[PDB]
Amino acid sequence: MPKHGKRYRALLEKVDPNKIYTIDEAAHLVKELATAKFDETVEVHAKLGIDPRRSDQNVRGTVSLPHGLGKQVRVLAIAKGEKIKEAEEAGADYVGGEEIIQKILDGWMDFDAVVATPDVMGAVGSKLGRILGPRGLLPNPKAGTVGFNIGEIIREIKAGRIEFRNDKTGAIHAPVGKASFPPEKLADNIRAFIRALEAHKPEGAKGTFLRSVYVTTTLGPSVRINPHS
RNA sequence: GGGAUGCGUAGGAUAGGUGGGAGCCUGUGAACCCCCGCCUCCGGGUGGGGGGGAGGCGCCGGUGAAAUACCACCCUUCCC
Ligand SMILES: OC[C@H]1O[C@@](CO)(O[C@H]2O[C@H](CO)[C@@H](O)[C@H](O)[C@H]2O)[C@@H](O)[C@@H]1O
8 A cells, every 4th residue: 555565565564765886785785685485686777878869879789798698588599500419518599490480470488599600691680680679689790699509598698697788868777697696796796797787888978977877686776886896 | 856748540548768677565454435635548547545454466368569566767748
């Protein structure tokens, strides 16, 4: 009946809204802000000094988190020839060709990432572009999700190679681990995401790039942080 | 500083963006009834209050370009 439940209201008292925390402080506090009945994902949020309306100020990139995402990633790989066996033995959850394209086309969605070899991307683009596109699941050499080293790509994605892309309002968000992680490992992951983010600052972007940065848990409150700590 | 606002069509119906998400809320009072302010696309929405006394919400499915609880950073148009 209030705006929040007693669980959440108990967490809110544990943060200081006026304080900008160091990354090390946030990394250590995060265990206290995670009281859901599952292992909560830790998230980093940044309000960016860009104009999201212009293409040359988009922020899009990937980063390999030093200590991963802390969760299984079901990877569907679309390949042909010897690469099918490569994808299989590299541990992709699903490996198919023409027929798996068909299956996705009819609304099968039970996977977390899609990767593909180049020599199948023609078909994947035309047929699946419409259905994976507006969900960001379409494989693409930009995101490291397309290549003939399909084995290596599957292992990199299982190891928590994330993509990040600002939203139309000028904010950006990413998962960076689990609240059960050791704090130093969380800190490593946070700093790595911030590092990758800053490396994608647009040349013509005006003013401070990271206008604000926050760390939070899946169902908990947030703490504002100093990205340069 | 504080508080509102977000509805083509289809779809429970009022779906602003993205990210997180498989759980969330509830005798620390669910459903439901009633009163008031605000907002309204006139469907309802939202905030508070008076009662009530045990169940709600999400997920899956379905519709859809997008799916919904809960949580985070934001944006639009406004008010005190
Ligand atoms: O998106 C697939 C993956 O995400 C989860 C939550 O982590 O489900 C989310 O995405 C679904 C696909 O649209 C939504 O329907 C669902 O409501 C949302 O939580 C997982 O359940 C799923 O494996």
